[PDB]
């Protein structure tokens, strides 16, 4: 049995990448592709936002004066914010902005361990230059989808839904690969669509590590 090795991590965009596997025996390509796709779409580490506090507002059904968008819409916009923390599993982000103009994610005060993948993301629009907005964004590390109802104190804190999942679209194809003279060798290429927080090769490595760890359940160590 030939051992698959990762040869290309070719990226066509910041959020789109294709990872190819050159050597594969017949029948192994589809098995590995399906298992990898399921284990990537299922469980990957993410860094979605969990909490948000705004000084003016009390409950997320209110409206802030001077802000174009509703507070619920602001929370929904924040839910899609993609951010990666490379040093901590918890961080507090502060956003301060004043004057007329859209409030983009680039306006968030940033630390060394926190970076924004797409600064062009917009949070809310300020229509009156007198009005100002301030937030305390709380970011946690997790996996899967954790609804805001299943958390298990102050009035000011606003709870948002948490969906820690860097990947959102995985597709794979099995193609014939020519190695030396023998045929039946298959090449598996996996096309990924992340939000930019998780590297492709690291994602494949983590997914395969989880798959190998789970295989030890019904087999002795090998």
């Amino acid at each position: 049995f030939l051992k698959p090795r990762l040869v290309d991590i070719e990226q066509v965009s910041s959020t789109h990448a294709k990872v190819t596997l050159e050597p594969l025996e017949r029948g192994f390509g589809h098995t590995l592709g399906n298992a990898l796709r399921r284990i990537l779409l299922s469980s990957m580490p993410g860094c979605a936002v969990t909490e948000v506090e705004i000084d003016g507002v009390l409950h997320e059904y209110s409206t802030k004066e001077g802000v174009q968008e509703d507070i619920l819409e602001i929370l929904l916009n924040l839910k899609g914010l993609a951010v990666r923390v490379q040093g901590k599993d918890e961080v507090i982000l502060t956003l301060n902005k004043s004057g007329i103009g859209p409030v983009t994610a680039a306006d968030i005060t940033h630390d060394g361990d926190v970076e924004i993948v797409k600064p062009q993301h917009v949070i809310c629009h300020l229509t009156d230059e007198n009005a100002s907005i301030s937030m305390r964004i709380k970011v946690q590390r997790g996996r899967g989808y954790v609804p805001a109802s299943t958390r298990i104190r102050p009035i000011g804190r606003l709870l948002v839904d948490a969906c820690y999942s860097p990947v959102e679209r995985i597709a794979y194809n099995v193609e014939a690969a020519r190695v030396e003279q023998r045929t039946d060798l298959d090449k598996l290429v996996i096309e990924m669509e992340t939000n930019g927080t998780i590297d492709p090769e690291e994602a494949i490595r983590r997914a395969a590590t989880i798959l190998a760890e789970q295989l030890e359940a019904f087999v002795d160590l090998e």
Partner: protein, 49 residues
């Protein structure tokens, strides 16, 4: 017969779940059966479930 009247407005945010009724426009009503995981749904060639 009453001194003061107090009205309290609660605002509960519903979410879809099995048992809810969902319907199209051409009279094809139905009830939600299972919230299938994202990876279990059928996907086309490009990988979109």
């Amino acid at each position: 017969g009453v001194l003061k009247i107090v009205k309290v407005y609660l605002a509960v945010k519903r979410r879809i779940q099995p048992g809810d009724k969902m319907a199209g426009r051409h009279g094809n009503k139905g009830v939600i059966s299972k919230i299938n995981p994202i990876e279990d749904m059928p996907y086309d060639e490009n990988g979109t479930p």
